[PDB]
Protein backbone atom coordinates (compact mmCIF):
# COMPACT_ATOMS: atom_id res chain seq x y z
CA UNK A 1 0.00 0.00 0.00
CA UNK A 2 0.80 3.72 0.58
CA UNK A 3 2.46 2.80 3.80
CA UNK A 4 4.84 0.15 2.36
CA UNK A 5 5.55 3.25 -0.29
CA UNK A 6 6.08 5.45 2.22
CA UNK A 7 8.49 3.07 4.19
CA UNK A 8 10.57 2.35 0.80
CA UNK A 9 10.91 5.99 0.09
CA UNK A 10 12.71 6.33 3.04
CA UNK A 11 15.37 3.98 2.09
CA UNK A 12 15.50 5.49 -1.44
CA UNK A 13 18.16 8.65 0.30
CA UNK A 14 19.86 5.59 2.01
CA UNK A 15 23.02 4.63 -0.33
CA UNK A 16 24.30 2.02 2.04
CA UNK A 17 22.53 -1.63 1.15
CA UNK A 18 19.91 -1.91 3.90
CA UNK A 19 17.25 -4.26 4.92
CA UNK A 20 14.39 -3.82 7.57
CA UNK A 21 12.54 -6.41 8.67
CA UNK A 22 9.48 -6.82 10.78
CA UNK A 23 7.69 -9.75 12.81
CA UNK A 24 4.45 -9.84 14.32
CA UNK A 25 4.45 -13.34 15.13
CA UNK A 26 2.56 -14.21 12.33
CA UNK A 27 4.32 -12.41 9.17
CA UNK A 28 7.99 -11.62 8.41
CA UNK A 29 7.96 -8.51 6.09
CA UNK A 30 10.79 -6.27 4.55
CA UNK A 31 11.97 -3.54 3.87
CA UNK A 32 14.69 -1.40 2.41
CA UNK A 33 17.53 -1.51 -0.77
CA UNK A 34 18.47 -5.45 -0.38
CA UNK A 35 16.21 -7.47 0.66
CA UNK A 36 18.66 -10.46 0.60
CA UNK A 37 20.24 -9.37 3.41
CA UNK A 38 17.24 -10.63 5.56
CA UNK A 39 18.48 -14.35 4.81
CA UNK A 40 22.30 -13.80 5.08
CA UNK A 41 24.08 -14.12 8.12
CA UNK A 42 26.23 -11.81 9.70
CA UNK A 43 28.05 -11.67 12.65
CA UNK A 44 25.68 -10.60 15.55
CA UNK A 45 28.14 -7.90 17.09
CA UNK A 46 26.95 -6.50 19.77
CA UNK A 47 23.68 -7.63 19.37
CA UNK A 48 25.00 -10.64 21.09
CA UNK A 49 24.63 -8.98 24.73
CA UNK A 50 20.90 -10.39 24.25
CA UNK A 51 22.06 -13.82 24.33
CA UNK A 52 24.52 -13.41 26.23
CA UNK A 53 22.67 -11.73 29.20
CA UNK A 54 20.49 -14.44 28.91
CA UNK A 55 23.12 -17.22 28.83
CA UNK A 56 24.88 -16.17 31.78
CA UNK A 57 22.13 -15.42 34.23
CA UNK A 58 20.36 -18.72 33.40
CA UNK A 59 23.28 -20.33 34.26
CA UNK A 60 24.35 -18.89 37.51
CA UNK A 61 27.19 -17.06 36.47
CA UNK A 62 25.83 -13.54 37.07
CA UNK A 63 22.79 -11.99 38.18
CA UNK A 64 21.20 -7.93 37.53
CA UNK A 65 22.32 -7.20 40.75
CA UNK A 66 25.87 -7.75 40.38
CA UNK A 67 28.46 -5.08 39.72
CA UNK A 68 31.14 -5.81 37.31
CA UNK A 69 34.10 -3.22 38.47
CA UNK A 70 36.76 -1.72 36.48
CA UNK A 71 39.55 -3.35 36.49
CA UNK A 72 41.67 -0.36 35.74
CA UNK A 73 43.01 -1.17 32.55
CA UNK A 74 41.87 1.83 30.39
CA UNK A 75 39.47 0.30 27.88
CA UNK A 76 39.03 1.41 23.85
CA UNK A 77 35.98 3.95 24.99
CA UNK A 78 37.01 6.31 27.77
CA UNK A 79 33.43 6.24 29.13
CA UNK A 80 33.46 2.34 29.67
CA UNK A 81 36.15 3.23 32.49
CA UNK A 82 33.71 2.69 35.35
CA UNK A 83 31.77 -0.38 37.13
CA UNK A 84 28.40 -1.36 35.43
CA UNK A 85 25.86 -3.84 36.37
CA UNK A 86 24.47 -5.94 33.21
CA UNK A 87 21.55 -3.98 32.32
CA UNK A 88 23.69 -0.69 32.83
CA UNK A 89 26.19 -2.12 30.79
CA UNK A 90 23.85 -2.92 28.37
CA UNK A 91 22.67 0.25 27.88
CA UNK A 92 26.41 1.62 27.86
CA UNK A 93 27.33 -1.23 24.91
CA UNK A 94 30.38 -2.16 26.96
CA UNK A 95 32.30 -4.53 25.85
CA UNK A 96 34.56 -5.74 28.08
CA UNK A 97 31.74 -6.64 30.98
CA UNK A 98 30.30 -9.14 28.65
CA UNK A 99 33.55 -10.68 27.39
CA UNK A 100 33.82 -10.92 31.21
CA UNK A 101 30.50 -12.70 31.27
CA UNK A 102 31.48 -15.16 28.28
CA UNK A 103 34.93 -16.64 30.53
CA UNK A 104 32.47 -16.44 33.53
CA UNK A 105 30.73 -18.66 31.12
CA UNK A 106 33.55 -21.08 29.33
CA UNK A 107 33.10 -22.36 25.70
CA UNK A 108 31.86 -25.72 26.48
CA UNK A 109 28.93 -24.14 28.28
CA UNK A 110 28.50 -21.25 25.73
CA UNK A 111 28.84 -23.62 22.64
CA UNK A 112 26.46 -26.12 24.21
CA UNK A 113 23.67 -23.07 25.05
CA UNK A 114 23.87 -21.62 21.83
CA UNK A 115 23.17 -25.15 20.34
CA UNK A 116 20.20 -25.50 22.76
CA UNK A 117 18.96 -22.48 21.56
CA UNK A 118 19.68 -22.72 17.87
CA UNK A 119 21.05 -19.34 17.79
CA UNK A 120 22.31 -18.46 14.61
CA UNK A 121 24.97 -20.78 12.91
CA UNK A 122 25.95 -21.56 16.56
CA UNK A 123 29.69 -21.43 16.09
CA UNK A 124 32.01 -20.00 18.21
CA UNK A 125 35.31 -20.69 17.38
CA UNK A 126 38.31 -21.11 19.94
CA UNK A 127 38.35 -17.77 21.49
CA UNK A 128 35.21 -17.63 23.94
CA UNK A 129 35.21 -13.57 23.65
CA UNK A 130 35.47 -12.81 20.28
CA UNK A 131 33.22 -14.79 18.35
CA UNK A 132 30.25 -12.47 18.04
CA UNK A 133 33.04 -9.75 17.36
CA UNK A 134 34.89 -11.52 14.64
CA UNK A 135 33.53 -14.33 13.59
CA UNK A 136 32.19 -17.45 13.23
CA UNK A 137 29.23 -16.62 15.04
CA UNK A 138 26.25 -15.59 12.29
CA UNK A 139 23.08 -14.97 12.12
CA UNK A 140 20.19 -13.46 9.58
CA UNK A 141 17.77 -10.70 9.86
CA UNK A 142 15.15 -12.93 10.18
CA UNK A 143 16.98 -15.41 13.20
CA UNK A 144 17.69 -12.30 14.84
CA UNK A 145 13.94 -10.66 14.68
CA UNK A 146 12.23 -14.15 16.11
CA UNK A 147 14.70 -14.08 18.29
CA UNK A 148 13.98 -11.29 20.07
CA UNK A 149 10.05 -11.50 19.06
CA UNK A 150 10.25 -14.67 21.41
CA UNK A 151 12.34 -12.80 24.20
CA UNK A 152 9.35 -10.69 24.28
CA UNK A 153 6.78 -13.15 24.60
CA UNK A 154 8.75 -15.04 27.71
CA UNK A 155 9.00 -18.07 25.04
CA UNK A 156 12.58 -18.68 24.87
CA UNK A 157 13.92 -21.60 26.44
CA UNK A 158 15.67 -19.82 29.52
CA UNK A 159 13.51 -19.62 32.88
CA UNK A 160 11.37 -16.34 32.35
CA UNK A 161 12.71 -14.33 35.15
CA UNK A 162 15.81 -14.24 33.68
CA UNK A 163 14.27 -13.24 30.26
CA UNK A 164 12.64 -10.42 31.88
CA UNK A 165 15.51 -9.15 33.46
CA UNK A 166 16.67 -9.55 29.93
CA UNK A 167 13.92 -7.91 28.68
CA UNK A 168 13.94 -4.69 30.71
CA UNK A 169 17.48 -4.36 29.76
CA UNK A 170 16.71 -3.30 26.05
CA UNK A 171 14.02 -0.64 27.72
CA UNK A 172 14.59 2.34 24.99
CA UNK A 173 11.27 4.36 25.54
CA UNK A 174 7.37 4.44 25.88
CA UNK A 175 4.61 6.06 24.32
CA UNK A 176 1.36 6.05 25.72
CA UNK A 177 1.92 2.64 26.62
CA UNK A 178 3.45 1.42 23.76
CA UNK A 179 6.79 0.36 24.56
CA UNK A 180 10.41 0.13 22.91
CA UNK A 181 12.99 -2.25 23.10
CA UNK A 182 16.48 -1.98 21.40
CA UNK A 183 19.88 -2.76 20.69
CA UNK A 184 22.63 -1.51 18.54
CA UNK A 185 25.19 -2.98 17.28
CA UNK A 186 27.86 -2.29 14.62
CA UNK A 187 30.39 -5.26 13.91
CA UNK A 188 33.69 -2.87 12.88
CA UNK A 189 36.16 -5.86 12.98
CA UNK A 190 34.87 -7.74 9.92
CA UNK A 191 34.62 -6.96 5.86
CA UNK A 192 32.26 -5.62 5.21
CA UNK A 193 30.82 -3.86 8.27
CA UNK A 194 27.84 -4.52 9.62
CA UNK A 195 25.21 -2.30 11.25
CA UNK A 196 22.38 -3.63 13.10
CA UNK A 197 19.39 -2.28 15.83
CA UNK A 198 17.17 -5.05 16.74
CA UNK A 199 14.30 -4.64 19.06
CA UNK A 200 10.62 -4.56 19.73
CA UNK A 201 7.31 -2.33 20.26
CA UNK A 202 5.68 -3.80 22.83
CA UNK A 203 1.90 -2.38 22.50
CA UNK A 204 -0.49 -1.61 25.50
CA UNK A 205 -2.70 -4.05 23.02
CA UNK A 206 -0.03 -7.24 24.27
CA UNK A 207 0.82 -7.50 20.75
CA UNK A 208 4.31 -7.38 19.86
CA UNK A 209 6.19 -6.01 16.95
CA UNK A 210 9.58 -7.21 16.64
CA UNK A 211 11.88 -5.62 14.10
CA UNK A 212 15.27 -5.64 12.74
CA UNK A 213 17.57 -3.12 10.89
CA UNK A 214 20.68 -4.62 9.09
CA UNK A 215 22.64 -2.83 6.91
CA UNK A 216 26.22 -2.23 5.40
CA UNK A 217 28.98 -0.09 7.74
CA UNK A 218 31.94 1.80 6.82
CA UNK A 219 34.34 4.12 8.80
CA UNK A 220 32.75 8.04 9.25
CA UNK A 221 29.33 6.66 9.18
CA UNK A 222 26.78 8.18 11.29
CA UNK A 223 26.57 6.19 14.67
CA UNK A 224 22.44 7.70 15.23
CA UNK A 225 21.09 6.77 11.65
CA UNK A 226 20.60 3.26 12.84
CA UNK A 227 18.35 4.17 15.50
CA UNK A 228 16.76 7.01 13.53
CA UNK A 229 16.30 5.61 10.63
CA UNK A 230 14.54 2.52 12.79
CA UNK A 231 11.99 5.12 14.52
CA UNK A 232 11.11 6.62 11.15
CA UNK A 233 10.85 2.88 9.36
CA UNK A 234 8.14 2.08 12.68
CA UNK A 235 6.53 5.54 12.37
CA UNK A 236 5.59 5.42 8.90
CA UNK A 237 4.33 1.61 9.80
CA UNK A 238 1.94 2.93 12.66
CA UNK A 239 3.75 0.96 15.17
CA UNK A 240 5.34 3.39 17.32
CA UNK A 241 3.78 6.70 15.98
CA UNK A 242 6.17 9.81 17.06
CA UNK A 243 4.46 12.06 19.61
C1 LIG B 1 28.86 -3.52 19.11
O1 LIG B 1 28.31 -4.04 18.15
C2 LIG B 1 29.99 -2.55 18.90
C3 LIG B 1 31.32 -3.28 19.23
C4 LIG B 1 32.39 -2.56 20.04
O2 LIG B 1 31.03 -4.57 19.80
C5 LIG B 1 29.61 -1.20 19.54
C6 LIG B 1 29.41 -1.25 21.06
C7 LIG B 1 30.52 -0.05 19.10
C8 LIG B 1 29.56 0.97 18.56
S1 LIG B 1 29.97 2.52 18.06
C9 LIG B 1 31.70 2.88 18.19
C10 LIG B 1 32.19 2.81 19.63
N1 LIG B 1 32.05 4.17 20.16
C11 LIG B 1 32.35 5.09 19.05
C12 LIG B 1 31.63 6.40 19.22
O3 LIG B 1 30.56 6.47 19.82
N2 LIG B 1 32.20 7.49 18.70
C13 LIG B 1 31.45 8.72 18.47
C14 LIG B 1 33.61 7.55 18.32
C15 LIG B 1 31.93 4.33 17.79
C16 LIG B 1 28.33 0.45 18.53
C17 LIG B 1 27.11 1.09 18.08
O4 LIG B 1 26.14 0.32 17.99
O5 LIG B 1 27.05 2.31 17.80
N3 LIG B 1 28.33 -0.81 18.96
Redesign the pocket.
Known sequence: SIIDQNVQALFNEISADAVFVTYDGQNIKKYGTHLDRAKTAYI??????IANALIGLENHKATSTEIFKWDGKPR??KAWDKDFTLGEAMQA???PVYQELARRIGPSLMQSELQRIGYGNMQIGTEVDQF??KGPLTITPIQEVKFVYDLAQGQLPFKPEVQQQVKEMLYVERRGENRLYAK??????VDPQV???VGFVEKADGQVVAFALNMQMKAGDD?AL?KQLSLDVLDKLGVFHYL
Open positions: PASTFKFFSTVWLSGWGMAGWYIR
